[PDB]
């Protein structure tokens, strides 16, 4: 559950927070709208695990694996079992054109997987829209009744370190690893006014990655519905956003600010970007 | 309203957030449970005012003025009119033993004041309990139907600078100005195990001030009910906590972590503590 009556935390012994010492001296740890930006050193995972366990939290993880991308599922799921929400209830939802190609991965207690078949659409326009469309429709089919939070990620990735309840909040986006140090004018937002995803050069907080977003089921249903509807308007107008659903996600999060932002620890590519000093942990990484 | 369907923010032009520059290099701006700690430089008030105005937010401010403390109401209310939640709907609730001594203060549009008489209890024990008791009971009489958030403060104070929607959240406490730089062993928590307010020497995040707390009506009703019930147990057991309801507030916020913490900018005493460099603004201050 979310936001229900909650019992007291138990007694816990941990280091006192230091009011006159910044938790990081090298990065921004809160947005200008007072959403935490989640980096290593900002959180005590023992306090957060207590808060979320006492609420009996269930986390849904959605992933799409189409055509040759089914090959990535084995490593994705095996590493999620080691690093993603361990100790909490998890429901994996694997959307695929090939149910028989989903690997038989052994799951920990309290963790389950459902395979959901996707239609093999002939038109690339419908394929482009599919993730937002399908995530929004499965909010009613399953997610509202089954999970408290949804996490929506790309499959061609692996977990290497802890990804846990520190990310959970009504709505979150993740700093794209290509742009976290960039000026807004360099962000690859959609720049043509004819598109619903358009953002002018003087607007924008961050460049969020389409490969990792999520929130409560209600807020993810709103985001995905809005992005799907915006993509259909663009298609009717004969325009395709420069980075497809990621451009629409960025427009949505500019206009509807997220309640947490995840650092690039949560969405990284070591082949392209190495391991900079500012990343103390590489948690979820591209497969080369 | 809180958490209802919300329209997009309008286009806004403001400086891009700097991911690789800390917003403060001298203080902690997020707790270990990922609640923002509100200092000057952490927030863009234009973005926050848009978010809260679009939700039609109403803020209730409660204050108790008993016996000679009615003398403080004129300056308290006049300075609240200049600095507290300007531009948003405000309902002041003045709890007093002397309704006729409440000054006629001129209020801005969208701002109203109600005078609520308190019983002149003969027993100091009932006086000690009165604020928590009365705030909890007026949650049903008025506050649930009238306001979205409650702010509960002491009267012997004045506003000198902006106190606005950056503080609003489901549950907040304020760093007491005497203890924000102190070790937890020096915090003046209740230390006798026989009291419901007891906190051992190895526990505690912060020392919160009883003079400034608040949150959504639901969460303030829970806090005040819990504190009142805990005080009644102590009275039956013939023990009075060292700092009365402030000791109980501290026990409650240790066990039920706040979703924002306000810096001592929001609760200060310049006669006793001066104007240190770490305070960029002195917002709400003791009257000498």
TrEMBL record, chains A, B:
Active site per UniProt: 246 (nucleophile)
One GO process term, biological-process aspect: carbohydrate metabolic process
Primary location: membrane
Lineage top rank: taxon: Eukaryota
GO molecular function, one term: hexosyltransferase activity
Cofactor(s) in the UniProt record: Mn(2+)
Membrane-protein topology: Single-pass type II membrane protein
Subcellular location per the Swiss-Prot or TrEMBL entry: Membrane
Keywords, comma-separated and alphabetical: Glycosyltransferase, Manganese, Membrane, Metal-binding, Signal-anchor, Transferase, Transmembrane, Transmembrane helix
Binding locations of Mn(2+): 154, 156
Binding site for UDP-N-acetyl-alpha-D-galactosamine: 64-66, 69, 154-156
Family to which this protein belongs: Belongs to the glycosyltransferase 6 family.
Protein name from the UniProt record: ABO blood group (transferase A, alpha 1-3-N-acetylgalactosaminyltransferase transferase B, alpha 1-3-galactosyltransferase)
Organism: Homo sapiens
Gene name linked to the record: ABO
Residue window of the full protein shown: 54 to 335 of 344
